Amino acid sequence: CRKKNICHHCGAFNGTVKKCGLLKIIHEKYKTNKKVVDPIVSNFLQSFETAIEHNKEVEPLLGRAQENLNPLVVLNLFKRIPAEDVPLLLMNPEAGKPSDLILTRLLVPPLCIRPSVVNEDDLTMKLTEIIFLNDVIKKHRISGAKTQMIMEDWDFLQLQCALYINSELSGIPLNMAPKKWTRGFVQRLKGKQGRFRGNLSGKRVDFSGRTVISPDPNLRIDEVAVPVHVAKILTFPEKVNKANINFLRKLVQNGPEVHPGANFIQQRHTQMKRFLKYGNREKMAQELKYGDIVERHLIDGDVVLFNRQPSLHKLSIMAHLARVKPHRTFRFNECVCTPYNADFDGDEMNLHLPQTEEAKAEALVLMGTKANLVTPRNGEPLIAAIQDFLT
Amino acid sequence: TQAEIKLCSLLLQEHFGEIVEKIGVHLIRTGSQPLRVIAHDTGTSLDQVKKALCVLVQHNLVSYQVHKRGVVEYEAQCSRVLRMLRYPRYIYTTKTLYSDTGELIVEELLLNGKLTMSAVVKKVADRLTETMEDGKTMDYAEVSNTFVRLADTHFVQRCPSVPTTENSDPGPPPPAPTLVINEKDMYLVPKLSLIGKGKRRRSSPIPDDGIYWQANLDRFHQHFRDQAIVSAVANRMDQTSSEIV
Amino acid sequence: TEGRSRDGGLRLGEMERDCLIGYGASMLLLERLMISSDAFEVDVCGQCGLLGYSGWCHYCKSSCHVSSLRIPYACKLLFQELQSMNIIPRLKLSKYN
Amino acid sequence: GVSECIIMGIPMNIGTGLFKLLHKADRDPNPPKRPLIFDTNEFHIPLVT
Amino acid sequence: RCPDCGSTELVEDSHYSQSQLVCSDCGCVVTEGVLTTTFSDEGNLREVTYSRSTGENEQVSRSQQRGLRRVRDLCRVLQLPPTFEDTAVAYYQQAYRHSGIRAARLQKKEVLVGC
Amino acid sequence: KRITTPYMTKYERARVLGTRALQIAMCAPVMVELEGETDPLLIAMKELKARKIPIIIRRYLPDGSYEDWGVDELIITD
Amino acid sequence: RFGSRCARIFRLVLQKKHIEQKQVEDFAMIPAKEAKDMLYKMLSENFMSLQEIPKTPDHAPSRTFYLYTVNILSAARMLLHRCYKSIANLIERRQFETKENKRLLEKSQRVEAIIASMQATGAEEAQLQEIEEMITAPERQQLETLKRNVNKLDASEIQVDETIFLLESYIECTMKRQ
Amino acid sequence: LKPPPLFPDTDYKPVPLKTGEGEEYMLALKQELRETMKRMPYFIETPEERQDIERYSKRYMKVYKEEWIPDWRRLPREMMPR
Amino acid sequence: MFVLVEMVDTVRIPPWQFERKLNDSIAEELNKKLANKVVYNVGLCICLFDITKLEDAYVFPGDGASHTKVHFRCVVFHPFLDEILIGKIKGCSPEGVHVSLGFFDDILIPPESLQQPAKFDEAEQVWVWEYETEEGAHDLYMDTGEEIRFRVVDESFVDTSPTGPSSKEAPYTLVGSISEPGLGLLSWW
Amino acid sequence: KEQFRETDVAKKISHICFGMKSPEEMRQQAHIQVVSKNLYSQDNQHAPLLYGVLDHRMGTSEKDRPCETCGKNLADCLGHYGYIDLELPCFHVGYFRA
Amino acid sequence: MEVKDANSALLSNYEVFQLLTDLKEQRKESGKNKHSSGQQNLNTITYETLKYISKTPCRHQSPEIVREFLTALKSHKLTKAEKLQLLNHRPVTAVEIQLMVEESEERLTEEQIEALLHTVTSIL
Ligand SMILES: [Mg+2]
Ligand SMILES: [Zn+2]
Ligand SMILES: [Zn+2]
Ligand SMILES: [Zn+2]
Ligand SMILES: [Zn+2]
């Protein structure tokens, strides 16, 4: 399309469009050319005699008179594009219309996404400034002062409105450039702390622990030893049914102090919990109905995950069958050092306790150590004997 | 052109009804396209689309054109849908220039969209029967006289006609009959001599076959432009000067 | 939260996310990353495609086309911001069959 | 894709998320229809000629 | 009041880490879990005066700002604690409310700062 | 006719065991005699070993067609 | 829409192809603080188009002259748009009035038909008053109010078309359609 | 604080309408026209639908009319109403 | 008055049900869910008539139940206009007489439907009758009475759906007619 | 006996359709028009102004102040939008290239 | 839930009686579980409809006698609506026959009306 310069529909000539200044656009219809002078530009040139008489500096730069693009003119232009043309411009008419691309209104986001104490968030201070400046223009124009300020004042508002969306613009002139950095919208989407990389893909979780690791060669290669103090914090919500009813009663009677005990109940119908510390009675044990859930402690045989933080290959995180033991550190059989690449020189490892029967089945079947004696890179064994067993 | 599209929807609703409005607005929104995709887009029975298109082309609202690969394209012009608003003005100035018989001729012509001389004069006479009573009657003679006078003065202009089948492209017909417009006979009325006394609602073959006609909208626009110019002149200096202009 | 003076909570880094796409354990990393962290419920109006409240769509002034969902909070937060930047994520939903 | 499923809170589309399970319940599809006595075709004919 | 018992014996208590509100009468939970700020955003903390946040301190006249500047300097040259400075500026800001105090000559205002 | 492989892949096994354990946590009938174990997943594993799980797998080809395979007629293995 | 003084300035700006406000106040007998706002109103409404020759190539507002200019062809186009919306809104209001009153219209039409029926059959006259006893009679003046409102809207539509003809006549004639 | 009411007052008012016998006749003609659009085939309404029962009255009150056909030599041979 | 309508729905069977044959469980669940309630276009539902066809019983992830889609037919109370009906009275009112069919009660006989001679009572709500030669303006309609004969002449659905953000009349009403001879109390004929 | 209503509206997402908001819809979504520059009331109560920013018709973020538009506390209020109008129209940074 | 057809077919009160009876055979066969109020809803509407139907003329009919009646009524060229109404009410005098049948005075004469009345009174 760019090759053409005459609108065939009405024979209307058009010139080049180009950015004349930062966030400022100009069209070049009334341009002089090295070739024969266009009649239209001669008619446009010859009309400034009045101002040329009033002011002398018009004469030197009468050749720089072009068509400046202002939000008003673009808006009142775009509004008149005909319906049949839009899809050729590749913007789907079900998604929007060009006339609305230029903005004249804004939403203030809810208070949820900008808390009270940042005192208030910078988006709030930005917004209160926008309205302040807007109120300035409307009273100022009503006050009927000279034109020059009216428009200059509008450029700073234009820049401030631009600066609200994003706070990186580098073209700001010296005498109004921000002295301090600020969180525009993209700044809270982008970045390593942004939503995508910080809160959607990888995020913080609960029902997990962390501690030093130390050796124990009397655990089977697929078991891990857990301290009692961390077994008393973590829970699993076992539903009551015909087979585990008697067991869960013994756990309830122990309360939250003797280890094989429990911490809460959730009634089948009235969904309020019942903190076992203040039960006043064992009678909750008798009242256990099918459908209640006991949040029991961790007990021997539960499937727990096990992870070392700089994870490089899929054997970095693996399932284990827990056993509960008295000291203050996690313990596992040294044959399993090589997957994790741990060394008992002050290391630490995490642990997670999956909360769903569906997640238990996957952890055991897919992520168990027994199913992962060999590395998928080339099939060689990775869990084998280490030093002092070879000797 | 969105306001305009709203006017199209409104006047289609008021003139024809829902389904006609729907088809017309969608077509003026999407441009020239073949039938099958229109039926797909609308989702209604193709019978409805077909009937609406027949009615629209009868009034010359939409136009169909043969297209490459043998498909037929259907199109509408936005300007044409902006004219019924002027029909009152048309009838007023025609009543100003011609007796009520010319008014009825023009009314029937616009309401039907296309019609031949014999049937229009007959329908005008029939619809005039209730405008005189006490044994008064009329013949097709006066109605024909008014019609030929109107056609001579260019208010009435002939519709397009088909090319002759036995002359052009003998054999199976093409998808569309590809009508052609002839200019020399635009004001050439065909001939008849039949006369009939209209029936006064007592509740008790074509010589001009195929010669259809339609009002000349451009003549009316020009005539209105002339009246506006004269009105400007009359106000400008004087009644005498406007009578001169 | 993240701290140790503040009560803590460990992180499933982007490396762990990828290890669990190593195993193909689809229900585990739904559980770890949603059920246990920031499960949430919202109301979306199917007719206009954007979220409302209390089973009442203020955009349409009606309640006959609202339906609830379960969606992580941080994703609900994302839809607020984008709608504020005048980039609207009109979401279209259907029966689960 | 995998990424979109993760951030939306729905199960990804590979691994254990590639197939559907049914229950082997004891059931009979399309069982005998209840016969209706009053409304049968041969007892109704249009009056209009 | 306990939704399950109606009794009003709710006691605020915490388990090893969770903060919660428990009906001590029957052992029921009625509320738990809290949302708090962190240390990471603590370092970014700013402050704004309520006057700045409510539309004041822009109407302070040239003479009023000069006067309060005088208050600051006269109090500080005498090595008083900042409490004396803040009480003095508060008193003078209150005193400036009076029409007969604000509309006056400079030396009278000076001796008013002195007193 | 059925084209796809006759063994039970590790993924099908994981999902079957998990779903059955969830159905046993809720008080569904159990199709095998139980000695006294409580953990649902051990009961699910015993049922699988006995070939008494009442589940059917619907394998989907990428085209859109599918095949029905019973859990008792795949060759389960180690 | 803006008073004689406003048309006094608008025409002034038309005949003076290039001018500035101080000249306008001097040449349009307008007091200070009365013109400025009015030009801003015309400019805001886009009936007046600012052309803005610069003092420097940066086209900075502090370095430009606010020379006004009229583009008659563009001006007409927005009025066309205005009239289009105008007729649209009238049509809607008339339809809105018709549909809200349709219940009373049909209630009246059925009894008018009943009164007009069997009149030639020679039935007794003991129906003209008996039918009229109902609530429709003290609502006929409301029906008349309806009818004149419709008539009066329609008269408004009619007059608008007369304008349309001239506006369209120009945008057609001013274009060459090449 | 309080935003302005949705209708701010305007000093100028719309100029009085022009009236006359010709204008009255235009108005009446427009009305009459509106009436005409409801009584010919080109007024395509939705085809009648959804009868309740075999009411005996169906014999008498049924609307009877000839099938509208345009002359077919002026249109494509593709859309016969039958 | 009874009509038969075809329907479709999805039914969740909670897992402790799995013993009983499926068809019975779906039938029970649908009767549970829909019985004795009124639909906005087909009137008041009585009970399901039969089940025509059943799809497969999926298990969705994260839940133990099995979801099935059902095609079934249900008999619905939907009288059409001008039906002749017999029904007990249930109460008089100035705007008409309320009538009851036992299982349903929203039937009104407005005074325009009543016979011309009787227009109002002696300030007692029990509606009286009048007639020319015999029955000297002394018959009256007991609030229960017998099953009077009457013919329906009007009906309506009125919506009751919630409006606005969250946090008594029946949605169906009928109008009857009594004017024609042979209607009303059987003793009259 | 009351109008039957379905109880389970549960559904699943199938598509995301991105797009744009024009002024009319942008007003239509919003509850209120922010018109005051200020943050808090002059009195020592420091209540936010009724038509300034922070108007609690736009939700809440303090554990004691429930929301006005919906009578819910912080834990449950989804949030609601307000709108601000510009005197002079201005370009949007994201689409300037467009 | 979705509706496929709102006017699929009519029904005779006899068929509804049969469905209620075969429900009643299923009813009270085992101890009520008191699972939820829907039991009350269903029992109430069904028992109310039974008690209502218990006072209708259609009782003690059978599929075959109804079928024979309708076969006999076939030749009379009544509408299916009128046939259903006749079946449901089993009228005993002429005056109501002047009511139910549309154009009763014009479509039929007295002897046909009497024959129909005979047929309904005798066959049922
Ligand atoms: Mg180390
Ligand atoms: Zn052009
Ligand atoms: Zn909505
Ligand atoms: Zn309690
Ligand atoms: Zn809220």
Side-chain angles (χ1 to χ4, degrees), chain A residues 107 185 189 195 197-198 200-206 208-209 307 309 311 314 317 350 352 356 362 367, chain C residues 1-2 9-12 14-16 23 25-28 31-33 36-38 74 78 81 83-84:
Chain A
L107 308 106
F185 279 117
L189 290 185
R195 296 293 92 82
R197 273 150 300 161
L200 301 186
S201 57
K203 67 174 76 168
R204 320 203 75 86
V205 314
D206 58 25
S208 62
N307 181 26
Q309 277 283 54
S311 293
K314 57 165 266 199
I317 178 165
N350 306 352
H352 310 93
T356 311
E362 292 189 357
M367 272 156 58
Chain C
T1 43
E2 84 84 39
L10 286 97
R11 188 172 166 77
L12 270 282
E14 311 205 39
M15 311 205 198
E16 280 67 44
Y23 288 97
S26 78
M27 207 63 50
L28 173 68
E31 184 283 297
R32 284 285 86 208
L33 305 177
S36 289
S37 290
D38 50 329
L78 176 66
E81 308 166 12
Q83 177 160 332
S84 181

Side-chain angles (χ1 to χ4, degrees), chain B residues 2 23 28 38 66-68 76 106 129 140 154 163 168 172 191 197 201 225 230 238 244:
Chain B
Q2 318 54 60
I23 185 67
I28 203 74
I38 331 301
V66 166
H67 190 66
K68 199 174 186 177
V106 177
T129 57
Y140 303 165
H154 317 291
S168 65
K191 314 303 183 293
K197 298 189 188 298
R201 205 181 176 191
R225 178 168 63 179
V230 173
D238 190 19
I244 292 308

Side-chain angles (χ1 to χ4, degrees), chain I residues 22-158:
Chain I
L22 209 65
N23 304 82
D24 302 348
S25 308
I26 307 85
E28 192 295 345
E29 280 285 344
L30 291 191
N31 264 331
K32 174 73 72 177
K33 186 176 177 186
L34 271 283
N36 199 353
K37 295 169 183 58
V38 61
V39 176
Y40 172 85
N41 302 19
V42 300
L44 173 55
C45 320
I46 303 302
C47 71
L48 84 85
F49 188 94
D50 67 352
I51 290 168
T52 67
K53 200 167 68 174
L54 293 176
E55 312 312 333
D56 291 321
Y58 295 177
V59 177
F60 292 127
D63 196 329
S66 63
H67 293 68
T68 175
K69 172 167 282 188
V70 184
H71 294 77
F72 69 99
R73 306 189 292 164
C74 189
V75 68
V76 77
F77 175 89
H78 186 64
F80 85 95
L81 286 181
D82 322 283
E83 281 195 74
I84 51 153
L85 315 103
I86 65 97
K88 290 185 172 69
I89 315 302
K90 61 141 282 184
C92 294
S93 79
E95 68 272 20
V97 176
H98 307 293
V99 192
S100 174
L101 272 285
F103 66 79
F104 191 88
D105 309 301
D106 296 71
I107 311 95
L108 178 69
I109 311 300
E112 294 78 8
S113 285
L114 281 171
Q115 306 95 311
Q116 157 57 247
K119 310 181 181 65
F120 188 56
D121 319 312
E122 58 265 50
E124 176 164 34
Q125 192 51 240
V126 188
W127 265 101
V128 306
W129 196 29
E130 314 180 37
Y131 160 85
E132 317 316 313
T133 40
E134 302 71 20
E135 206 287 278
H138 60 61
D139 191 18
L140 79 182
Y141 321 142
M142 167 53 188
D143 289 318
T144 63
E146 63 264 69
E147 293 81 8
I148 61 152
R149 297 157 311 313
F150 63 97
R151 208 171 311 155
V152 57
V153 291
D154 201 11
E155 84 303 321
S156 191
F157 290 105
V158 307

Side-chain angles (χ1 to χ4, degrees), chain K residues 16-32:
Chain K
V16 175
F17 194 171
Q18 296 312 110
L19 295 185
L20 202 163
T21 58
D22 67 31
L23 177 66
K24 188 178 180 291
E25 288 176 9
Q26 195 278 311
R27 197 188 170 228
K28 297 186 178 186
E29 75 188 346
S30 64
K32 61 196 174 188

Side-chain angles (χ1 to χ4, degrees), chain A residues 3 29 55 58 65 115 122 148 161 188-189 272 352 371-372:
Chain A
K3 293 167 169 61
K29 175 189 280 267
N55 176 283
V58 180
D122 53 351
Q148 315 309 68
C161 178
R188 45 196 284 168
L189 290 185
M272 70 295 299
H352 310 93
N372 291 274

Side-chain angles (χ1 to χ4, degrees), chain A residues 7-12, chain G residues 175:
Chain A
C7 172
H8 335 127
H9 147 271
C10 58
Chain G
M175 187 37 57

Side-chain angles (χ1 to χ4, degrees), chain I residues 4 6 8-9 32 84 101, chain K residues 1 4 8-9 36 52 89:
Chain I
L4 190 145
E6 287 63 34
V8 62
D9 213 28
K32 174 73 72 177
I84 51 153
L101 272 285
Chain K
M1 181 316 297
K4 302 307 302 183
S8 98
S36 79
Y52 176 79
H89 285 73

Side-chain angles (χ1 to χ4, degrees), chain A residues 274, chain E residues 2-7 10 23-28:
Chain A
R274 169 142 285 153
Chain E
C2 176
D4 193 22
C5 309
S7 57
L10 305 195
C23 172
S24 64
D25 188 37
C26 75
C28 181

